[PDB]
């Protein structure tokens, strides 16, 4: 497929719709969206592993990682393919997602469809904090909200 | 940290062209640091419906204010005591009513954030009444 579409919801008053299209296979990824009820400033936003969300955002399991690498920002190198950053929240609470990643893909070995998508109670630090879990998770915290990825018409 | 209450406070009596300060405390609720309202000040004068004023988002510093209160009234926030503030100041005797706080869902779209219908949460008001 080349075009993903993804609905965030939670605990709280966080939600939002994220878009996917990869144009050609194995390019670049265009992710774009909006997300509400976010407080002002940066949120690590990463694909997890399992797009299963029975028990919310808890089951879907840690970041998207095939090549077993350690936590990053999504230019490193050292990076998990679902390493997508930070989206920064204005100051109504809302952050226009527009970004382009080429790890990430909508098909082959790191696609992300039937995934989770999740937006985080704090920034990513992107692997830089001087602690273990900054190479785990990047000190994110808590997941506000998150959706399974779907093929998008 | 039963369910979210509110309550107001500073109301009184001005004559027309002073100033007035209303505070608005709330407490319970998800006390979850992630948990965003659109905060924020309503009135209700004799006869006439209920209408909004101010808000404030408590996840940031984005405010709103009605047609009626621009230039006049400023709204701000404690965030820590969880205290949002309405200064009303070049009060007119229109102004008269009762004033109450109210808090709406974080996520409430443009145009839903200062409309009564939307709110949640109520306190139960401090009168406002300017003098000709």
């Known amino acids: 497929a080349t075009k993903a579409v993804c609905v965030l919801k939670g605990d709280g008053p966080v939600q939002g719709i994220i878009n996917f299209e990869q144009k050609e296979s194995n390019g670049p990824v265009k992710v774009w969206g909006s997300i509400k009820g976010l407080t002002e400033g940066l949120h690590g936003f990463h694909v997890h592993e399992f797009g299963d969300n029975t028990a919310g955002c808890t089951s879907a399991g840690p970041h998207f990682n095939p090549l077993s690498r350690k936590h990053g920002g999504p230019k490193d190198e050292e990076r998990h393919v679902g390493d997508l950053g930070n989206v920064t929240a204005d100051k109504d609470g809302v952050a226009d997602v527009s970004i382009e990643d080429s790890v990430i893909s909508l098909s082959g070995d790191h696609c992300i469809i039937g995934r989770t998508l999740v937006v985080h109670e704090k920034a990513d630090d992107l692997g830089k904090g001087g602690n273990e879990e900054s190479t785990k998770t990047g000190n994110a915290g808590s997941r506000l909200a998150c959706g399974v990825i779907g093929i998008a018409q | 940290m039963a369910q979210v209450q509110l309550q107001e406070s500073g109301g009184g009596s001005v004559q027309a062209g002073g100033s007035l300060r209303l505070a608005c405390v709330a407490s319970?609720?998800?006390?979850?640091?992630?948990?965003?309202?659109?905060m924020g000040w309503y009135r209700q004068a004799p006869g006439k419906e209920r209408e909004g004023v101010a808000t404030?988002?408590?996840?940031?510093?984005?405010?709103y204010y009605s047609d009626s209160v621009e230039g006049r009234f400023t709204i701000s926030q404690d965030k820590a005591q969880r205290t949002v503030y309405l200064q009303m100041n070049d009060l007119k005797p229109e102004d008269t009513a009762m004033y109450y706080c109210a808090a709406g869902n974080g996520a409430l779209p443009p145009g839903r954030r200062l409309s009564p219908q939307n709110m949640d949460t109520w306190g139960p008001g401090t009168q406002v009444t300017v003098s000709s």
């Open positions: 404030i988002y408590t996840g940031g510093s984005g405010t």
């Open positions: 319970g609720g998800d006390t979850r640091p992630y948990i965003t309202y659109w």
